[PDB]
């Protein structure tokens, strides 16, 4: 019988006896139902409207095999410390997703369910991406190993720097700042995320002048240099036009704001970079609009996994100690998800599912934002060698200029690497290690003096 | 359980799924268009009463959208009787045509009203 | 003197004496500072880090004229009913933005400020887009007037329907459902937002079968029909490939999930649709992840203005009475922002700034989600003639099938239009109007019987 | 010929009245795409001046109203109708929409009258 | 205010909007052609009396422009009676065809005259 | 020189171009226009068509009728310069569309001193 | 109401009480009417025929809102010491123009009005281009700042030179003249305006030889050169 009418979602979408398949996409939702809505019905509604069902019974369900396609809420767990909040686990069959499309994956899982009247708030905490689906993506154009091999850089974190002021500089002054920064010991400099093409500085003029500066610094130091040229644009055509010129200039790396630009355009650029040998730096502009609050949105670890699939060689991961929010344990959690091939479930770090990557290249985490020389020991200890540490104001804010500012950061970093390698405890001896270096490095001494009392300590919103 | 008919079920857009308009209901629709200060106009067609595609197939292109204008749009008309009168005049000269009443909004330049007022024999 | 060191943001970015220019982009931020952070400093931080400044003083500011480029917090207002919450108004010079790029506009305004440790929460409520900037965008490929003229439809809201189940149907069964739905009186049918290309149904097979069904229904009824073919894909290339085939088939309309696909890809499609005569339906999948909560995120009216600039002929606006959240006054507010050429400031509807569009075409609002025949009077009263009302489950959930389900909705709609035109009050006489029609329409009577007791009434999260 | 000489201080005014273009130079140009003979032969029109008409108002009409005006003009006996010189592509009417509706209009008029039409 | 008819209003180019040509009016048109030293020729068509598009739709292409030639162009003709004589002959053999008279200017190789001289019953 | 032609010009068979007469003309000008330009020309009537009291179709009919009436008269040997007005008036007797147009623009003329003189 | 017939242009297009919008394109015309034509009518005719109107009334005006589209003469002032000459100010709504097209802008403003019989003469003196319209254009490919930065030239006017004779020189002699000019201190040399491609010197040959010459001059002097 096709029985017209409305039925509870849990009658079809709540299956606590379900045993997940290794090909299913699993999701962990933090659900806050409206008063009077049972968690089983709330979890079932989420599973239903993000897979195959709607608000009333439709006869067409009988034309197919819904048991084979439906999303299922198979487990519910109360959240300790919160009121009327539960973690609902949902399983999605592999067949529901388009191969190689992060865009399609999110359209189903976070498409319409966050606006349901029956819910007060909803947050997607984690996703278990099956290896069968992982293999349908290209992943990073290059990855950690290949990047280090192309740039010939090993044994220490990489060093970067964002040019400032954010906006307002001319193309020639941009290259001027880039040259001075790179010749001082930094490996990279970069366009600020909002620097695309504007009246005060058009993109082609910028690309041209930055390449001149970049090549001059490389010749001067003898170390390979790069400047992330921003390809972020208003259309696919414009984005490609910029990437193409970078290819013509023979430079090593370009960047893209993957969330403001979009997954569709990002995947296009990722494939182009793979086919043309360009490293791709990814900026996460806008992410905090989505992942800051504990009760609603999507946690960054989910946005991070999505980027590793779509494609990017670098991605910002936070600093923990900088001007932007980021808890230590949670950060270490998604940093492993970005670099390793296998990460086991660990609730203390917000990792709800064991994730395997079947050799998809790792992504270099980038620590940036309000950090300076005194943070060097802590950054090195937290992230390890495979990371990129960026100092924008921390370089251009040095009293002697860009080159001396770059030297101070390079010296501070190597001093920490040497001390660590010798067996010293960076966490306990951090400050003394920096002080020891100021004795022979006037550039570092000048920097330490300026930012000695600067720290960023506030209560975090995003907590496990 | 009723099966919706497939034969001779042609429709005419807005209002065509309701029962045929009586003389008073028709007058009320005209009053509605006049009270909104829209400009009334009559259109008629004898050959192609429904859209088709003969000269082109690209997106958004269809033949049969344009019908013939009866005289001119009645600018300044404030009396519904004047509109109903032209309808009768048009019907007398073209008893074999489909007749449509439309109303123009000159500020947005969009027809805010459009409905068949007369259909020939067999429809 | 270039004085190295950290200074408060308010020293440079809080200018309460500033008089805005007609070329400035104005933003209204709902700011919730951390305890101990003055609202002037919090507002200044937002203005600074979203325009030209960083956390410490940089010498390069002296190479340019910062007074001419800096974002400025020019007004602060306490929010009544909340604690330690303020509305901070920020002005951004026209020069800071790339012409025709919504991607660039958001990268600056919502790029990094939402993650600042110094803030507990941040929400962007509104944006005043100056006419000088509006003219750099193409806007909708066609707009309300042109769409009605191309389809030859006037004097009533348009009618649509999403095919169900969401996923799981084969290409042939999809066309089968489409034909039956359209022949019953609906103007459009559509791919569900997550229906792109999958194992159970590949896109080209779907496009092909839907065109056959679409053309059969048009021939049968004599009214122009359309089916939104989803062009949403994983890359720009795939998206274009699908749009191209739709063009070859000669069909009138395609659709795109602009947020999951991304602004860059959406703008590309918008331009293509303009050059090839295709109407473009926009689905807002994922929007609730961003705009549901009052304390953090971006209000939908901002996402709505962004779409009108990038380009789209339709966009979902909510139903107010359906299964998804949406307050009446707030909804009417952004519906005017989508259709009209001029909307004056009105705080009772959440409109913070007067917005002018200098003839940029209007966008048709689409009401969809958990609505049925009894909601018809209210929908017609709220949205008026220029709207698209969609009934997915409300059509395929009818006891007699798709055609009778379509008839019931078409009849219900025209009955309301006729009653309204005759001078009857839809708000007061709504129910009686529907009952009167059930006397001569067995299709409508069957529908009314099934959903008679179904309503969606829950407390709203998003309130002015 | 008229590049810089009209601005010479030594002159009060200057006007180019005529030009004798030698046949050897004339042969280096394509000239009219078709010309009088070929045009009359393509349109099958002979024995009288051709008739045209510029749609009005110059600016301000929508694409659909433009095609409406065109069909009514052509069906009455005019051979051609035309966009006003300043009608290119504007907010009130984009070019592709105008082209499309004018095509529907002119083909309707041609079928009705039996005489070849153009816009 | 009169509305221009839409039904059975086919036209035949030059002179077709004027009242039907009388016997003498027709003769004067032939005199005009002959006085200008253009050479007369008659063409007739039985099935496709109006242009259409069956074989191609590119710019400038139309089917139905060419009609069938009646004998040959009357080179060296100086007597209008001779032309009106062939017209009657053509009508006798093809009473069901449209017949038009054209005048050739061999110097410009352009038809300077062309008008329908006979139409089958019903037109 | 009486027509401002300073040099003899040859075109070695380059196709000719159709001159187009347009701008503030109406039915009463038809005889003069036909007389000045001849068959190889295009006469355009914008306001002269959309300004007809009965609309576009009747406006077009008025112009097509006026034109064919002048062509017929000319071919019969009548002087368009001397009999122009009479020829138009004769046609108004059987063409109500033309009659209505003639009534509207009968007094309209554009006569001003010319700047560009020989 | 549609009433056929001719009316004076001033009844619709002369609006002395109109206050201009910041989005309007403003034009200042130097108008010389024929004897007997009032300046108000002359000004109104220019505004009308360069925007929405024609010589007689048309019913189609009622299909749109002419008030938001019509161009309008909003001010008239006499010209000192000149007989029967005035400066007429006309405002054009932003909606009348195609974005980024100077071709379209001139087609309206100076398309047909200069030939009106009712005028003895007409001259467009100035144009106020609104910022909303300015933003629809790319503008200079580079501009002053960028040019100086690319060429590395600051603190003085740049120096150029047109090669002579205007026409008649071969491609090699052209390059010969160019090298000699540039090596002496000039920043640029240039093709005369009428030097395109001719029997005495084809363009590709010229481009080729001039490149050789300018690179030689640049290497010799150490200053960036161009032709
Ligand atoms: O715009 C800025 O603020 C930065 O250039 C850093 O400048 P400073 O080096 O001067 O602080 C970076 O984009 C942020 O680090 C991005 O945040 P995250 O890394 O969290 O994505
Ligand atoms: O997936 C769905 O649920 C729908 O197809 C509606 O189905 P029903 O017609 O069966 O409810 C629509 O996409 C939502 O209306 C989108 O939400 P909104 O309009 O708020 O963007
Ligand atoms: O804009 C106009 O005025 C017209 O459309 C005529 O309108 P009317 O038919 O309503 O007068 C024509 O472009 C002019 O004839 C051009 O002048 P010319 O032919 O001298 O170049
Ligand atoms: Mg940045
Ligand atoms: Mg949907
Ligand atoms: Mg014109
Ligand atoms: Mg020169």
Q: E and A: touch, per 3+ CB pairs < 8 A?
A: no
State which of C47, C59, C108, C112 you would mutate to test the pocket of ligand 1, scoring each by most atoms of that ligand within 8 A of its C-beta: C112
Give me the residue from B2, B58, B62 closest to C224, CB to CB.
B62
Residue F19: CB within 6 Å of ligand 3?
no
Active-site residue, selected from the candidate residues C153, C164, C172, C271: C164
For the CA of C56, the nearest ligand: 1
Q: Does G145 touch chain A (CB under 8 A)?
A: yes
CB contact under 8 Å between B109 and G64, yes or no, is: yes
- My answer on whether A111 and A165 are in the same domain is no
Instruction: Tell me the CA distances in angstroms from E20 to C403, E12, E17, E25, one per residue in order.
Output: 56, 12, 9, 9
Report the distance separating Cα B17 and Cα C184, nearest Å: 10
| Atom of ligand 3 minimally distant from the CA of G58 | 10
Report the distance separating Cα E83 and Cα C457, nearest Å: 90
Report the distance separating Cα A26 and Cα A20, nearest Å: 8
Q: Does some domain include residue C289?
A: yes
B44 φ/ψ angles, rounded to the nearest 5 degrees: -140, 155
- My answer on whether C90 and C215 are in the same domain is no
Q: Which residue of F has its CA nearest to G55?
A: F24
Residue whose structure tokens are 């064991």: A354
**Which residue, judged by its Cα, is nearest atom 4 of ligand 3?**
F23
| Helix (H), strand (E) counts: chain C | 19, 15
> Residue E63 forms beta bridges with which residues?
E52
| Helix (H), strand (E) counts: chain A | 19, 15
C114 φ/ψ angles, rounded to the nearest 5 degrees: -70, -15
Q: Are C289 and A131 in contact (CB under 8 A)?
A: no
Q: 3-class SS at G225?
A: coil
Q: Does some domain include residue C462?
A: no
Q: Does G1 touch chain B (CB under 8 A)?
A: yes
Q: Does some domain include residue C238?
A: yes
CB contact under 8 Å between D20 and F8, yes or no, is: yes
Q: Are D48 and G46 in contact (CB under 8 A)?
A: no
- What sign for the dihedral angle of Cα C140, C146, C152, C154? positive
Q: Are D79 and D45 in contact (CB under 8 A)?
A: yes
| Nearest residue to C171 via CA among C226, C213, C217 | C213
Q: Are D86 and F71 in contact (CB under 8 A)?
A: no
Q: Look at residues A86, A106, A137 and tell me which one is the last residue of a structural domain.
A: A137
Nearby residues of C174 by Cβ (< 8 Å), 6 or more positions away: C163, C201, C206, C209, C210
Structure method? X-ray
Residue C70: CB within 6 Å of ligand 2?
no
Rg (CA), chain F: 16
As given in the structure block, the two tokens for residue C269 are 């499609």
**Which residue, judged by its Cα, is nearest atom 14 of ligand 3?**
F23
**Domain limits for position A131:** 11-137
Q: Are F74 and F80 in contact (CB under 8 A)?
A: yes
| Nearest residue to C461 via CA among A292, A115, A31 | A115
CA atoms within 13 A on the CB side of D111: 13
Report the distance separating Cα A286 and Cα A303, nearest Å: 11
Residue B53 CB neighbour total at 10 angstroms: 14
Q: Are A79 and A85 in contact (CB under 8 A)?
A: yes
As given in the structure block, the two tokens for residue B105 are 């909004």
Give me the residue from G5, G55, G60 closest to F104, CB to CB.
G5
- DSSP states along C145-167: HHHHHHHT--SS-EEE-B-SSSS
Report the distance separating Cα C91 and Cα C20, nearest Å: 7
Residue whose structure tokens are 């990073």: A140
Q: Are A373 and A447 in contact (CB under 8 A)?
A: yes
Q: Does an H or E element contain G56, and which? A: none
Ligand 4: distance of its center to the CA of A59 in Å? Answer: 52
Q: F and B: touch, per 3+ CB pairs < 8 A?
A: yes
The CATH number of residue A442's host domain is 3.20.20.110
Report the distance separating Cα C283 and Cα F31, nearest Å: 62
Instruction: Tell me the CA distances in angstroms from G180 to A238, D54, G165, G175, G220, one per residue in order.
Output: 42, 58, 15, 9, 11
The DSSP secondary-structure symbol of B109 reads T
| Nearest residue to E6 via CA among C401, D74, A392, C353 | D74
Cα–Cα–Cα angle for G207, G212, G217, rounded to 5 degrees: 120
Report the distance separating Cα C5 and Cα C11, nearest Å: 13
C309 φ/ψ angles, rounded to the nearest 5 degrees: -80, -55
| Nearest residue to A404 via CA among A374, A443, A430 | A443
CB contact under 8 Å between G34 and F115, yes or no, is: no
Report the distance separating Cα C315 and Cα C386, nearest Å: 12
Instruction: Tell me the CA distances in angstroms from E100 to D44, D79, E90, E91, one per residue in order.
Output: 13, 20, 10, 11
Q: Look at residues A137, A159, A178 and tell me which one is the last residue of a structural domain.
A: A137
Give me the residue from C144, C155, C185 closest to B114, CB to CB.
C155
Report the distance separating Cα G15 and Cα G68, nearest Å: 13
Rg (CA), chain D: 21
Residue D85: CB within 6 Å of ligand 3?
yes
Chain D positions in Cβ-Cβ contact with residue G63 (cut-off 8 Å)? 61, 65
Q: Is C227 annotated as a binding residue?
A: no
| Nearest residue to G135 via CA among A309, C95, C291, A388 | C95
Q: Which residue of C has its CA nearest to G21?
A: C358
Task: Round to the nearest angstrom and report the end-to-end CA distance of chain E.
Answer: 26
Task: Round to the nearest angstrom and report the end-to-end CA distance of chain B.
Answer: 26
- My answer on whether C133 and C169 are in the same domain is no
Rg (CA), chain E: 16
Cα–Cα–Cα angle for C321, C325, C329, rounded to 5 degrees: 70
- What sign for the dihedral angle of Cα D72, D77, D80, D82? negative
G84 φ/ψ angles, rounded to the nearest 5 degrees: 50, 50
The CATH number of residue C17's host domain is 3.30.70.150
- My answer on whether A130 and A148 are in the same domain is no
| Nearest residue to G92 via CA among G30, G47, G62, G131 | G47
- DSSP states along chain F: -TTS--S----TTPPP---EEESS--GGGHHHHHHHH-SS-EEE-SHHHHTSTT-HHHHHHHHHHHHHHHHHHHHTT--HHHHHHHHHHHHHTT-HHHHHHHHHHTT-------SS--
Report the distance separating Cα D16 and Cα D2, nearest Å: 8
Task: Round to the nearest angstrom and report the end-to-end CA distance of chain A.
Answer: 47
Q: Are F65 and F97 in contact (CB under 8 A)?
A: yes
Structural domains in chain B?
Answer: 2-123 (3.30.190.10)
Q: Are E73 and E86 in contact (CB under 8 A)?
A: no
Q: Are C293 and C462 in contact (CB under 8 A)?
A: yes
CB contact under 8 Å between E7 and B70, yes or no, is: no
- My answer on whether C248 and C390 are in the same domain is yes
Sheet containing A364-368: give its strands across.
Answer: A158-160, A388-390, A364-368, A314-316, A279-283, A253-257, A226-230, A188-190
As given in the structure block, the two tokens for residue A151 are 């740039």
CB contact under 8 Å between E6 and B68, yes or no, is: yes
As given in the structure block, the two tokens for residue C261 are 């696909």
Chain B positions in Cβ-Cβ contact with residue C401 (cut-off 8 Å)? 1
As given in the structure block, the two tokens for residue A213 are 């500066």
Q: 3-class SS at E3?
A: coil
The DSSP secondary-structure symbol of G61 reads G
Note the Cα C326 to chain centre separation in Å. 12
- Resolution to one decimal, Å: 1.8
CB contact under 8 Å between D91 and C359, yes or no, is: yes
Active-site residue, selected from the candidate residues D9, D56, D64, D117: D56
- My answer on whether A67 and A154 are in the same domain is no
Instruction: Look at strands A355-356 and A388-390 and give their pairing.
Output: unpaired
- My answer on whether C252 and C340 are in the same domain is yes
Separation in Å, CA of F112 to nearest CA in chain D = 23
- My answer on whether A116 and A253 are in the same domain is no
| Nearest residue to F68 via CA among F113, F34, F18 | F34
Nearby residues of D111 by Cβ (< 8 Å), 6 or more positions away: none
Q: Are C320 and C331 in contact (CB under 8 A)?
A: yes
Q: Are F110 and F100 in contact (CB under 8 A)?
A: no
Q: Are E11 and D115 in contact (CB under 8 A)?
A: yes
- DSSP states along C106-151: HHHHSSSGGGBTTEEEEEEEEEE--HHHHTTS---SS-HHHHHHHH
| Nearest residue to A412 via CA among A395, A437, A381 | A437
Instruction: Tell me the CA distances in angstroms from E115 to D44, E91, E98, F64, F112, one per residue in order.
Output: 11, 15, 11, 15, 40
**Which residue, judged by its Cα, is nearest atom 9 of ligand 1?**
A392
D111 φ/ψ angles, rounded to the nearest 5 degrees: -65, -35
- My answer on whether A152 and A130 are in the same domain is no
The DSSP secondary-structure symbol of B60 reads T
Is C314 one of the annotated active-site residues of the chain? Answer: no
- My answer on whether C423 and C441 are in the same domain is yes
- What sign for the dihedral angle of Cα A301, A307, A308, A312? negative
Report the distance separating Cα E119 and Cα E100, nearest Å: 9
Q: Does D63 touch chain C (CB under 8 A)?
A: yes
- My answer on whether C158 and C217 are in the same domain is yes
Q: Is G196 annotated as a binding residue?
A: no
Residue G58: CB within 6 Å of ligand 3?
no
Rg (CA), chain B: 16
- My answer on whether C323 and C355 are in the same domain is yes
- Burial class (CB within 10 angstroms; exposed 0-12, middle 13-18, buried 19+) of C275: exposed
As given in the structure block, the two tokens for residue C373 are 């025949």
Number of domains in chain C: 2
CB contact under 8 Å between B59 and C407, yes or no, is: no
Largest Cα–Cα separation, chain D:
64
Ligand 2: distance of its center to the CA of A58 in Å? Answer: 14
Q: Are C130 and C23 in contact (CB under 8 A)?
A: yes
Q: Does an H or E element contain C339, and which? A: helix C328-339
Residue A457 CB neighbour total at 10 angstroms: 6
Ligand 5: distance of its center to the CA of F68 in Å? Answer: 63
Q: 3-class SS at A142?
A: coil
Report the distance separating Cα E63 and Cα E53, nearest Å: 5
Q: Are G6 and G65 in contact (CB under 8 A)?
A: no
Q: Does F34 touch chain D (CB under 8 A)?
A: yes
Chain A positions in Cβ-Cβ contact with residue C260 (cut-off 8 Å)? 103-104, 106-107, 111, 263
Q: Does some domain include residue C460?
A: no
CB contact under 8 Å between F51 and G58, yes or no, is: yes
Q: Look at residues C111, C137, C163 and tell me which one is the last residue of a structural domain.
A: C137
Task: Round to the nearest angstrom and report the end-to-end CA distance of chain C.
Answer: 47
Report the distance separating Cα F85 and Cα E31, nearest Å: 25
Residue C199 CB neighbour total at 10 angstroms: 12
As given in the structure block, the two tokens for residue C419 are 């009653």
Q: Does some domain include residue A460?
A: no
Q: Is D45 annotated as a binding residue?
A: no
Report the distance separating Cα A134 and Cα E61, nearest Å: 56
**List of long-range contacts for G97-101, beta carbons under 8 Å, 24+ apart:** G97/D90, G97/G25, G97/G133, G98/D88, G98/D89, G98/D90, G99/C135, G99/G133, G99/G136, G100/G136, G100/G137, G100/G138, G101/D88
Nearby residues of B96 by Cβ (< 8 Å), 6 or more positions away: B46, B120, B121
Residue whose structure tokens are 């490939």: C241
Q: Does an H or E element contain A126, and which? A: strand A119-128
3-state DSSP of chain D: CCCCHHHCCCCCCCCCCCCCCCHHHHCCCCCCCCCHHHHHHHHCCCCCCEEECECCCCCCCCHHHHHHHHHHHHHCCCCECECCCCCCCECCECHHHHHHHHHHHHHHHHHHHCCCCEC
CA atoms within 13 A on the CB side of C135: 24
The DSSP secondary-structure symbol of A365 reads E
């Amino acid at each position: 019988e096709f029985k017209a009418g409305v039925k509870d979602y849990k009658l079809t979408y709540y299956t606590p006896e379900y045993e997940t398949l290794d090909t299913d996409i699993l999701a962990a939702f933090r659900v806050s139902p409206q008063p009077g809505v049972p968690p089983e019905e709330a979890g079932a509604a989420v599973a239903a409207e993000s897979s195959t069902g709607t608000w009333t019974t439709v006869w067409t369900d009988g034309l197919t095999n819904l048991d084979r396609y439906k999303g299922r809420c198979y487990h519910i767990e109360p959240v300790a410390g919160e009121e009327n909040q539960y973690i609902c686990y949902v399983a999605y069959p592999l067949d529901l997703f388009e191969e190689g499309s992060v865009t399609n994956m999110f359209t189903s899982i976070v498409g319409n369910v966050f606006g349901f009247k029956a819910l007060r708030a909803l947050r997607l905490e984690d996703l278990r991406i099956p290896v069968a689906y992982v293999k349908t993506f290209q992943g990073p154009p290059h990855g950690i190993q290949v990047e280090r091999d192309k740039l010939n850089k090993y044994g220490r974190p990489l060093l970067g720097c964002t040019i400032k002021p954010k906006l307002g500089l001319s193309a020639k002054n941009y290259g001027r700042a880039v040259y001075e920064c790179l010749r001082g010991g930094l490996d990279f400099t970069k366009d600020d995320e909002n620097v695309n093409s504007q009246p005060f500085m058009r993109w082609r003029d910028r690309f041209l002048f930055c390449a001149e500066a970049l090549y001059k610094a490389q010749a001067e130091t003898g170390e390979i240099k790069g400047h992330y040229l921003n390809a972020t644009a208003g259309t696919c055509e414009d984005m490609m036009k910029r990437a193409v010129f970078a290819r013509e200039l023979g430079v090593p790396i370009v960047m893209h704001d993957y969330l403001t630009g979009g997954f569709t355009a990002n995947t296009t650029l990722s494939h182009y970079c793979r086919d043309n040998g360009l490293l791709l730096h990814i900026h996460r502009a806008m992410h905090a609009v989505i992942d800051r609050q504990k009760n609603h949105g999507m946690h960054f670890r989910v946005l991070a996994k999505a980027l590793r699939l779509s494609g990017g060689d670098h991605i910002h991961s936070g600093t923990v100690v900088g001007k932007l929010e980021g808890e230590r344990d949670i950060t270490l959690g998604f940093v492993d998800l970005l670099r390793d091939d296998y990460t086991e479930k660990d609730r203390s770090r917000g990792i709800y599912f064991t994730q395997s990557w079947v050799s998809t290249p790792g992504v270099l985490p980038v620590a940036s934002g309000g950090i300076h020389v005194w943070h060097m020991p802590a950054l090195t200890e937290i992230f390890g060698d495979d990371s990129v540490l960026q100092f924008g104001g921390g370089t251009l804010g040095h009293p002697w200029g860009n080159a001396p500012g770059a030297v101070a950061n390079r010296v501070a970093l190597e001093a920490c690497v040497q001390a660590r390698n010798e067996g010293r405890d960076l966490a306990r001896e951090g400050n003394t290690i920096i002080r020891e270096a100021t004795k022979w490095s006037p550039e570092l001494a000048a920097a330490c003096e300026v930012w000695k009392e600067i720290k960023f300590e506030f209560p975090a919103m995003d907590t496990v | 359980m009723k099966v919706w008919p497939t034969q001779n079920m042609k429709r005419y857009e807005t209002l065509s799924y309701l029962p045929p308009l009586t003389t008073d209901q028709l007058a009320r629709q005209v009053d509605y268009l006049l009270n909104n200060k829209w400009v009334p106009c009559l259109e008629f067609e004898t050959d192609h009463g429904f859209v088709y595609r003969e000269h082109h197939n690209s997106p958004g292109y269809y033949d049969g959208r344009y019908w013939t204008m009866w005289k001119l749009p009645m600018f300044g008309c404030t009396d519904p009787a004047q509109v109903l009168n032209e309808l009768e005049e048009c019907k007398k000269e073209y008893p074999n045509a489909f007749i449509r009443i439309i109303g123009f909004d000159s500020n947005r330049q969009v027809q805010c009203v459009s409905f068949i007022a007369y259909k020939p024999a067999g429809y």
